[PDB]
Amino acid sequence: TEQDIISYVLYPKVYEQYIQTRNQYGNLSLLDTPTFFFGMRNGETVEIEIDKGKRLIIKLETISEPDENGNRTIYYAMNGQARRIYIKDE
Amino acid sequence: TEQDIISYVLYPKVYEQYIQTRNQYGNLSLLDTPTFFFGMRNGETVEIEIDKGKRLIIKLETISEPDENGNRTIYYAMNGQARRIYIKDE
Numbered sequence: 001t002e003q004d005i006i007s008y009v010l011y012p013k014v015y016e017q018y019i020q021t022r023n024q025y026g027n028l029s030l031l032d033t034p035t036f037f038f039g040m041r042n043g044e045t046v047e048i049e050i051d052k053g054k055r056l057i058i059k060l061e062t063i064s065e066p067d068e069n070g071n072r073t074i075y076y077a078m079n080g081q082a083r084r085i086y087i088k089d090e
Numbered sequence: 091t092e093q094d095i096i097s098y099v100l101y102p103k104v105y106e107q108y109i110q111t112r113n114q115y116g117n118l119s120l121l122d123t124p125t126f127f128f129g130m131r132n133g134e135t136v137e138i139e140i141d142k143g144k145r146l147i148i149k150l151e152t153i154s155e156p157d158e159n160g161n162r163t164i165y166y167a168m169n170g171q172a173r174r175i176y177i178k179d180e
Binding site: 042043062065082 | 152157172
């Protein structure tokens with residue numbers, strides 16, 4: 001869009017780095033600030049409000065200890081669905 | 091059975107606590123001995139042998155933190171079926 005075009009031209013380095021981030025994590029502005037800054041506790045349930053009457057209901061159940069490569073397994077439930085994610089601990 | 095009758099007569103209290111355990115955990119005598127004394131570690135696959143060619147296949151994935159009831163959640167796979175147990179941390 002036009003707003004893309006002056007955005008990139010005002011801020012080449014930063015806009016591109018923002019797209020790179022939009023591509024990786026989606027729309028962060030929808031998250032609530034505490035979630036944005038801190039993530040989630042064990043047992044917690046957060047309700048990300050996407051849109052008019054559509055929401056992400058996420059629960060963080062547990063986080064594993066890291067395997068040999070330093071990857072951890074977060075156990076989530078998200079809209080009634082067992083889900084497992086892998087994050088490299090740094 | 092007659093065997094129960096006589097066993098109780100020999101050891102009243104102790105027969106009664108055997109019964110109580112058997113009600114709660116079933117037939118422990120089928121576990122391999124190291125599993126019987128120590129349980130399992132994170133990531134381990136143990137195989138309880140039942141009748142010939144029917145084995146219980148159990149995998150321990152993680153144990154959660156104790157919650158505010160002091161119950162830890164164990165995430166298992168048993169015969170390729172995800173499954174989860176609440177155990178009280180003492």
